Amino acid sequence: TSIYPKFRAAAVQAAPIYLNLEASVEKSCELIDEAASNGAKLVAFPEAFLPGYPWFAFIGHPEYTRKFYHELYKNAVEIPSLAIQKISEAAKRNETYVCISCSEKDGGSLYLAQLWFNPNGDLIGKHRKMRASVAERLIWGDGSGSMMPVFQTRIGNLGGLMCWEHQVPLDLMAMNAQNEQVHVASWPGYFDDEISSRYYAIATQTFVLMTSSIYTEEMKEMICLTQEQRDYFETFKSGHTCIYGPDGEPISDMVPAETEGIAYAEIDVERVIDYKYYIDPAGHYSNQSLSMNFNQQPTPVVKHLNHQKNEVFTYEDIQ
Amino acid sequence: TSIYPKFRAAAVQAAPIYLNLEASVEKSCELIDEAASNGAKLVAFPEAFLPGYPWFAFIGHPEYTRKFYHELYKNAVEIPSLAIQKISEAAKRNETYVCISCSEKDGGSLYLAQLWFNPNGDLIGKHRKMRASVAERLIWGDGSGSMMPVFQTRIGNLGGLMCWEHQVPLDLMAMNAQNEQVHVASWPGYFDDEISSRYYAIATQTFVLMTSSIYTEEMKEMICLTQEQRDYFETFKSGHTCIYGPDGEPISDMVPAETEGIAYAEIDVERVIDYKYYIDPAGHYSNQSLSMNFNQQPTPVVKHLNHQKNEVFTYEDIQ
Amino acid sequence: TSIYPKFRAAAVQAAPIYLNLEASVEKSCELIDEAASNGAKLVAFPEAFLPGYPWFAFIGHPEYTRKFYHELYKNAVEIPSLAIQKISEAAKRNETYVCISCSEKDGGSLYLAQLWFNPNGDLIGKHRKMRASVAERLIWGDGSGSMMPVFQTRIGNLGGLMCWEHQVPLDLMAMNAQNEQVHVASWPGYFDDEISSRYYAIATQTFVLMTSSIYTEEMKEMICLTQEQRDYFETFKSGHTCIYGPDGEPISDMVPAETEGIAYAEIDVERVIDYKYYIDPAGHYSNQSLSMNFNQQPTPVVKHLNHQKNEVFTYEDIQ
Amino acid sequence: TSIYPKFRAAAVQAAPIYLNLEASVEKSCELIDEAASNGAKLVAFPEAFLPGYPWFAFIGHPEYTRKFYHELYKNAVEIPSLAIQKISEAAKRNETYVCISCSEKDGGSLYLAQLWFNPNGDLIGKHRKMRASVAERLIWGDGSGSMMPVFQTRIGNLGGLMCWEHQVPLDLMAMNAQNEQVHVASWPGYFDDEISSRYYAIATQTFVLMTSSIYTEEMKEMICLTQEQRDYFETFKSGHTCIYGPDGEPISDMVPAETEGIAYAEIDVERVIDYKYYIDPAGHYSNQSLSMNFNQQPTPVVKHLNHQKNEVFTYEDIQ
Amino acid sequence: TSIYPKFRAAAVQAAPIYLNLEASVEKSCELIDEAASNGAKLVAFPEAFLPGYPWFAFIGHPEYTRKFYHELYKNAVEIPSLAIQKISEAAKRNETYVCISCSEKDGGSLYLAQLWFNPNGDLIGKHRKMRASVAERLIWGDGSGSMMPVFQTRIGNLGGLMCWEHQVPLDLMAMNAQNEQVHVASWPGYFDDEISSRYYAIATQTFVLMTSSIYTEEMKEMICLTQEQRDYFETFKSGHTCIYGPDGEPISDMVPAETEGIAYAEIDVERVIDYKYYIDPAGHYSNQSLSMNFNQQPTPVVKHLNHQKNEVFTYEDIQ
Amino acid sequence: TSIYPKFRAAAVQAAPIYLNLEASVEKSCELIDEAASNGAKLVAFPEAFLPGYPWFAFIGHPEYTRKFYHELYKNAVEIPSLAIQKISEAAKRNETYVCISCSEKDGGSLYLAQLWFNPNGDLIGKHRKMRASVAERLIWGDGSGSMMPVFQTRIGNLGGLMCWEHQVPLDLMAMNAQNEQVHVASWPGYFDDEISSRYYAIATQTFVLMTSSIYTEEMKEMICLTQEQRDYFETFKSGHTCIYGPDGEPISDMVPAETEGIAYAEIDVERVIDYKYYIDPAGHYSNQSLSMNFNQQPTPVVKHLNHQKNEVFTYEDIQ
């Protein structure tokens, strides 16, 4: 059954404790508590909030990036791990949906992921970024079609994309093919957020939670090792955090620039219908000459068949 | 292969409960019960019967139509849904074939479909209207060649078309090339339906069940806001419900104008042979200089390849 | 191949002589002359400029729309016609590439097409709007994948889309696949232009000439028969005419709203390289799990194979 | 159909004229002439020889890299282009097989390709690097499994991989599956070439022509703007040009470091049999538990179906 | 469907021209002509007839075996190859079924195969040895379950195994599970015991054609380099050639030992019925406790998905 | 959770008491004691250390090899056995991980295995060689993918491979998919080992303990029964023992050639993070067109279901 719920949604503008997974998880737990105590049933977090965006990749050569990549790698989120437990506990305690972006570790490599938690505390799914940006390509691997999920939840069809994924038409079509209704748009802060998120709202008929992070002083201390690097990183632009309706107009007030806050709006999923009337690129508003292939088969480099665990032959069993 | 059965047909003239899916489905079940108790093996319903034809799109401007499109979209039939279960149970209980028209919600779009149920109660197929007619283009998307089925059943080769689809020669040829024998011609009740249906009977050498809807006071009160709208919608002419032989001549009584009723006829599929003798455009009555391309491949905007479920991690599993 | 020229472009904000083909073509010739005299080597026009956007289709029911559709149909552009000749002659005389939008008549139907002319007056190609928006569906038919050109010219790779084609990701994908560099974004003047055109500039890494028309009093006096119609049409917001760089930022002045005027800019096609560095959805910035089927086969209803003419037996021979 | 010819191969150790495609192509012609005049029937070139390896990507931050990406983009090789014409003419004139590496411009994206020419002057194939290194992901997109060719030729089964592709086991197995016999290992001259090329020779039972480039002073002047950058770049270690037999031992003379020269070796393809006797990972030396999937289908973002051409209505026809 | 034909079989006792593919193929064609001209409709050849059995592998250390492996490899049978063409033409021109064993080359490694030809000259299938005997493991690789064919032909169900595959119970059960009726037991000599082939006949209820080779002096001069090797090899036993019925008793005459000749027998497939009465391990003579897994999936190391052909941009096209 | 521990590893260069399992196990215990007393928390051993590598298989024909295979078979390791007991006791007494290679007897067949013991003396796992080399095929059966373990321990992720498994790319991918960090490369001493182990280090981002054996007079006088055999066996080249870091550079002194000794190094598992940064073939450094199937299902020839224990009717009960 197609439901059309109403709910309050929270978009978070915050900075993590840079490259500190433990402190960042504590901060995000506090923020989920705050938003849910303010009535939110969905909390969205900026891009790579756990443990923080690799801003070092953009202000030095890759050898300089290696040293800080080491520390980021030591603070990536594994599944299962204590960070997942903490976010799950917060989601269950607050009875809210959570979208939290993180640096995920799978084997020997890092990926950028959005982790989704439901009010039961379940990790219902994740989305790895399809393709990394100019210097993010030094840090994170690419995603796959098997991890572009839309969840048919009790507060609408929920999905999300990260940063410049909103500027990739095929990602838009992959999300619009599954009838996404409420969208989480995670941004780091340096790249332009307004045009892309508003256009996504219009072209996918989605309420868009635009969440973006801020720059703190300790990050500048940690990664700016020279004065030239300090000034160059100072020139970086600020992001915005806001919520848009399916027409692209805002329905909440932008958080003040470079401060930490939360934006709140009343999502009324019944509004998406009025704009499905106008346009539905994956439906009526289409032409037979243009189609797309969405491959959702898992594509690990090594596919395990009949995986089995090792059984130890104990010291007592030997002697 | 090549069987010529005899059976009793039922063409229904009736109106639904306007933009109320549950009430309209109850009325459809009652009508199927009445038809099958009278001895029919096939029951046909007018165009867009579930939950009703969108007449609000012909007496106002598009922004006026948007408001009522909202209610219709909230009342469209989904596959699967409760409406499908009710109609399938009616078909199985009454052991009849059923062709019922409806607004079909696939994804975030609406389509106009004819649903077919066999006496076992299965949904054997659906036909989406190929091209929405004047002012229906604001409500429904276009169909595709993959959804123009002819069913080889125990009562003949059954098929259908909706309203002005009978005036598009390529649709006639698509039906003929599949060797259609018994045709359900659904009409909404406002467009001249006699000539097109009789011509279809002659040109495709099929028995034609013509079914139409009637207007009600509930519909008028709901969709008429001004008095000029009421007067303009009061001039709309009525439809007709009648059954024709493969010569285009009626084999049952036309149902009285603007009244609920059912037309019954004795269909002799063996009779179509004597008119295939005269003419068969898809067979012996062709010329090598003219030919048709019937592309029956699916035409979805997004092709889902290797659609596979992803695992979910529960709270207890994480804890 | 792979040149990067510098030239002057001109987006036009003007209204036609509503539903008047001759005066509209004369106005277009004058505007081309003016823009070319001001140094412009590319001139672009609003959507459906010749002879006018069917605003009547949005402020009344289909039967009222029919009367004005009659007069629009009588003033549609044909290829070949006198209008095509005059526009080609103006383009040749002023030695400018010209993109002009119009209602195009092909046999019995009408289509919405952008017509492209080069400095030699050659009608180098046309693009038909691939899908009508809301009430344009009562007026125009659909385009084909065979009418989505990108022209390799002396001033870069040119192309264009109309109105809500910019909100269809597959159209953006098809345009980006052809390495478009300078894009004409034609808008009618009632829908929301800024977000879409700017996002297109960013996502395709192209210069965008956003052109939009204005509302004239003669149009209102023609199509606002009653007072409710006049007041309802008076609430229609106007559009904007600007030019953007590949980063989505404006490189010219906004033409004043509801005023006739032209926006000029300097187009250095080299700037696109600095943004192909960042993102290129059809190239490096892709994921192998997603892909698009761009079908460019012509799709008329009836293919005229081995077309030939008739043997006119003149009167003199017979006697 | 199995042949084991004898011939003379030539590995080139040279630098291009940095970011100057014409001069680099001319130097390539000169080097092919010199190598062929000494009886060489195969000539192999360093990685990204046309127009030069993007060293700037490793000695600055991404925005500094963008400036030189502009110049590299303006100097990439298109297929067809003048550079391909001239290299084909040289390959024909000297009746030699040429493996030359370059930056390939395919639409709006750059790729790192190896181009193969035969003694007739045909462009017999093309290999795109499957993945990019720590840096250079900023510069080049990834390749596909449909561009890993092994050519059955008059001098054996030829193939190639660039730089760290020799450290990717599945690339080795993809080449081994096709019975590659003579291999070209292109290296830029900063990564450690010797171990990887020797292991490739042993594992695939092939002769390996290892070709590295050298650093010039014009390159340092071009890309080192500050003193710190110049000092950091001057620590980059050089590569080497060797030729190895199927056992991994060198069968030629190492070219002196940082010097322009060609290494010549006598290649007897029959020697591979004595090592297929020992080990054949793709054949007899395998376990059914470990297998590989090799997808050779094209993977373009947008594939064209029924591609057509846009006819033009010349000016002399319109009038 | 089930037939029990009567036909004449022929088992060949001969030796090839050692490690000489052309002469060995000519001799095999002559033997086929002789056998078919004597009325034989099935002609079986010894194990590894083409170009010869690697006896050198049994009379020296692996390095000594390497030298002759070189020659055997250069004379292995490919598919397609001239040897296949000649054997297919012989089978066609004689209208006989042919089971010839050879050293098949596939990629870079060698396999021991039986090749099957029908009276029309087709290559109906092939069987690769599942495991090489002691020193054969130096020369050949393992076969797979996908290459254990039984051919349902006009002379009954046909199959074959090679020396010591008749001593592997699972191979026997694999052949019994497919209802083999006429079997070819190919032996090279010096392993051949009558016991294995007679037991196979009894256990599978098949006729068994036992074909063995002989030793020539060319072989001894070529491989026995020293006197010690000459004596040790001269110790080697001689095989036997004859035909056995479903009870294991001979139904033909022994070919004299170490001389060239052909054994003939009349094969009446009906006789197998009288022994399926007694025992049928794969059918009634079984126990549910014991079962066999027969995996017939292909098991190559590299699976080529969507294999594509190489395209060349020819020289004239470049110019 | 992931850990990056620091420890000291020991690579052993030794020879066993040839074809004497009890004396060899004594020598292993002594070497474990010596190495662990020097701080080593891991001890690695040469290939086929217990009871010795079958050198006789390379200097004679298979019948000659049969006699010494008799003794090796009589001196093979079993699980459970006294040898396993002694090695577990040494590993526990010394609180060290131990990797020891041996000839494993399982049923009636011999295998080449690596046995892993933890500081508690538990036989944590076993790895059988996937494919025997040239003459080892006479001696040992093949392995399976169920026996390719990576052990998650307190001193990193441990794994091993034997001799030419390092030249099989799918073996490397199988180890890399399991995220190996410290690797034991046991070699026999006659096959080249430096290049293969260094490449494995680089291409798996692992510390590599390359252990090799030496030759003894007792071995030579036991297997070289002829002067020619002795002269041929004396030309065999010596292996080396060393420890490499994740970059392929040595991190210890090479043990002097043809002498007994142990190599020591400090292993900082955190160093692998600096090389996952720019290569990880099983993770980010991968292409979607090349994948691997890793089947870990147990593959015994006979699968025992519901294994039992036979009842015995003791003599007293019967009487």
Tab-separated table of C-alpha atoms in Angstrom, chain C residues 9-162:
chain	number	residue	atom	x	y	z
C	9	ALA	CA	26.594	34.912	-27.786
C	10	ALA	CA	23.210	36.603	-27.418
C	11	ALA	CA	20.166	35.271	-25.572
C	12	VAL	CA	16.946	37.099	-26.451
C	13	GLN	CA	14.079	38.026	-24.114
C	14	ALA	CA	11.193	38.923	-26.412
C	15	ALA	CA	7.582	38.071	-27.131
C	16	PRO	CA	6.137	37.305	-30.584
C	17	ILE	CA	3.150	38.787	-32.387
C	18	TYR	CA	0.876	36.236	-30.784
C	19	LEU	CA	-0.473	33.581	-33.169
C	20	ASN	CA	0.710	35.633	-36.155
C	21	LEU	CA	3.348	33.866	-38.234
C	22	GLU	CA	4.352	36.661	-40.615
C	23	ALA	CA	4.776	39.383	-37.998
C	24	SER	CA	6.510	36.927	-35.656
C	25	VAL	CA	9.027	36.015	-38.365
C	26	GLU	CA	9.573	39.701	-39.137
C	27	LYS	CA	10.220	40.392	-35.448
C	28	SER	CA	12.632	37.447	-35.332
C	29	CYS	CA	14.529	38.793	-38.341
C	30	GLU	CA	14.787	42.213	-36.695
C	31	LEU	CA	16.031	40.707	-33.432
C	32	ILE	CA	18.635	38.641	-35.283
C	33	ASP	CA	19.796	41.742	-37.149
C	34	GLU	CA	20.150	43.694	-33.905
C	35	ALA	CA	21.978	40.944	-32.012
C	36	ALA	CA	24.363	40.324	-34.909
C	37	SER	CA	25.053	44.049	-35.247
C	38	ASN	CA	26.044	43.993	-31.570
C	39	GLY	CA	28.703	41.374	-32.389
C	40	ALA	CA	26.747	38.223	-31.534
C	41	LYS	CA	27.696	35.083	-33.464
C	42	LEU	CA	24.981	32.941	-31.842
C	43	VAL	CA	21.373	34.046	-31.328
C	44	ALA	CA	18.805	32.018	-29.376
C	45	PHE	CA	15.065	32.521	-28.927
C	46	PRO	CA	12.428	31.565	-26.338
C	47	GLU	CA	10.450	28.350	-26.492
C	48	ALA	CA	7.729	28.246	-29.154
C	49	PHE	CA	8.553	31.786	-30.250
C	50	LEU	CA	7.001	31.302	-33.698
C	51	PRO	CA	4.078	32.150	-33.509
C	52	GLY	CA	3.650	31.960	-29.709
C	53	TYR	CA	3.409	29.717	-26.658
C	54	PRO	CA	-0.103	28.226	-26.325
C	55	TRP	CA	-0.974	30.010	-23.089
C	56	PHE	CA	-4.649	29.439	-23.901
C	57	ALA	CA	-4.181	25.736	-23.125
C	58	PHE	CA	-3.553	26.555	-19.445
C	59	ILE	CA	-6.518	28.833	-18.623
C	60	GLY	CA	-9.484	26.831	-19.871
C	61	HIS	CA	-10.884	23.421	-20.674
C	62	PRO	CA	-9.975	21.417	-23.798
C	63	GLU	CA	-12.968	22.631	-25.823
C	64	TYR	CA	-11.970	26.260	-25.282
C	65	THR	CA	-8.360	25.324	-26.042
C	66	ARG	CA	-9.515	23.842	-29.359
C	67	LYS	CA	-10.609	27.164	-30.870
C	68	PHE	CA	-7.191	28.740	-30.327
C	69	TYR	CA	-5.375	25.548	-31.304
C	70	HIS	CA	-7.093	26.014	-34.656
C	71	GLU	CA	-5.428	29.398	-35.158
C	72	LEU	CA	-2.071	28.147	-33.880
C	73	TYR	CA	-2.271	25.220	-36.308
C	74	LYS	CA	-2.964	27.660	-39.138
C	75	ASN	CA	0.241	29.585	-38.286
C	76	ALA	CA	2.559	26.643	-37.631
C	77	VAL	CA	5.935	26.559	-39.350
C	78	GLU	CA	6.461	24.052	-42.157
C	79	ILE	CA	9.751	22.812	-43.606
C	80	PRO	CA	10.009	24.099	-46.358
C	81	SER	CA	8.018	27.326	-45.909
C	82	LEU	CA	8.387	31.091	-46.176
C	83	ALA	CA	9.319	31.390	-42.492
C	84	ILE	CA	12.232	28.970	-42.847
C	85	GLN	CA	13.407	30.926	-45.891
C	86	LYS	CA	13.285	34.279	-44.102
C	87	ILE	CA	15.077	33.011	-40.994
C	88	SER	CA	17.716	31.283	-43.124
C	89	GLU	CA	18.244	34.461	-45.143
C	90	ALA	CA	18.641	36.509	-41.961
C	91	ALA	CA	21.149	34.006	-40.566
C	92	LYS	CA	23.146	34.067	-43.808
C	93	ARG	CA	23.051	37.859	-44.109
C	94	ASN	CA	24.212	38.312	-40.520
C	95	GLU	CA	26.580	35.298	-40.622
C	96	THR	CA	25.357	33.999	-37.273
C	97	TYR	CA	24.280	30.670	-35.874
C	98	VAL	CA	20.575	30.952	-35.035
C	99	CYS	CA	18.514	28.714	-32.768
C	100	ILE	CA	14.808	29.537	-33.007
C	101	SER	CA	11.911	27.655	-31.424
C	102	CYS	CA	8.516	27.303	-33.068
C	103	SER	CA	5.434	25.158	-33.546
C	104	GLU	CA	6.305	22.777	-36.375
C	105	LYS	CA	3.708	21.222	-38.683
C	106	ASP	CA	4.483	17.747	-40.059
C	107	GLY	CA	1.499	16.498	-42.016
C	108	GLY	CA	-1.557	16.525	-39.803
C	109	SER	CA	0.178	17.017	-36.451
C	110	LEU	CA	2.028	19.806	-34.660
C	111	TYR	CA	5.395	19.542	-32.926
C	112	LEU	CA	7.558	21.780	-30.765
C	113	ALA	CA	10.986	22.119	-32.363
C	114	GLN	CA	14.148	24.168	-32.065
C	115	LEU	CA	15.428	25.057	-35.545
C	116	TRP	CA	19.163	25.589	-36.018
C	117	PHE	CA	20.683	27.769	-38.738
C	118	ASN	CA	24.351	28.413	-39.447
C	119	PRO	CA	26.130	31.480	-40.876
C	120	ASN	CA	25.409	30.113	-44.373
C	121	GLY	CA	21.646	29.892	-43.876
C	122	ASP	CA	21.634	26.087	-43.868
C	123	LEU	CA	18.912	24.549	-41.719
C	124	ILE	CA	21.475	22.268	-40.133
C	125	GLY	CA	19.030	20.411	-37.893
C	126	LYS	CA	16.063	20.488	-35.571
C	127	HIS	CA	15.321	19.100	-32.115
C	128	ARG	CA	11.744	18.194	-31.203
C	129	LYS	CA	10.704	18.425	-27.562
C	130	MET	CA	10.669	14.804	-26.459
C	131	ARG	CA	7.577	15.178	-24.249
C	132	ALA	CA	4.932	17.852	-23.706
C	133	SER	CA	4.661	19.197	-20.179
C	134	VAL	CA	1.060	19.540	-18.959
C	135	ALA	CA	-1.333	21.142	-21.429
C	136	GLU	CA	1.175	21.260	-24.261
C	137	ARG	CA	0.131	17.613	-24.586
C	138	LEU	CA	-3.132	18.892	-26.075
C	139	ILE	CA	-1.096	20.803	-28.689
C	140	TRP	CA	2.127	19.004	-29.619
C	141	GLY	CA	3.412	15.491	-30.208
C	142	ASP	CA	6.508	13.760	-28.902
C	143	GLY	CA	10.004	13.932	-30.339
C	144	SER	CA	12.371	11.102	-31.165
C	145	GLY	CA	15.885	10.096	-30.217
C	146	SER	CA	16.820	10.884	-33.822
C	147	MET	CA	16.134	14.595	-33.191
C	148	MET	CA	18.644	15.258	-30.384
C	149	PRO	CA	21.509	16.785	-32.361
C	150	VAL	CA	24.723	18.289	-31.118
C	151	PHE	CA	26.279	20.264	-33.955
C	152	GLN	CA	30.048	20.451	-34.337
C	153	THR	CA	30.420	24.002	-35.618
C	154	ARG	CA	33.063	26.717	-35.847
C	155	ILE	CA	31.999	27.979	-32.399
C	156	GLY	CA	31.967	24.666	-30.508
C	157	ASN	CA	29.534	21.823	-29.978
C	158	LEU	CA	26.057	23.380	-29.989
C	159	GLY	CA	22.747	21.973	-28.818
C	160	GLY	CA	19.565	22.868	-27.029
C	161	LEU	CA	16.618	21.705	-24.971
C	162	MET	CA	13.280	23.309	-24.127
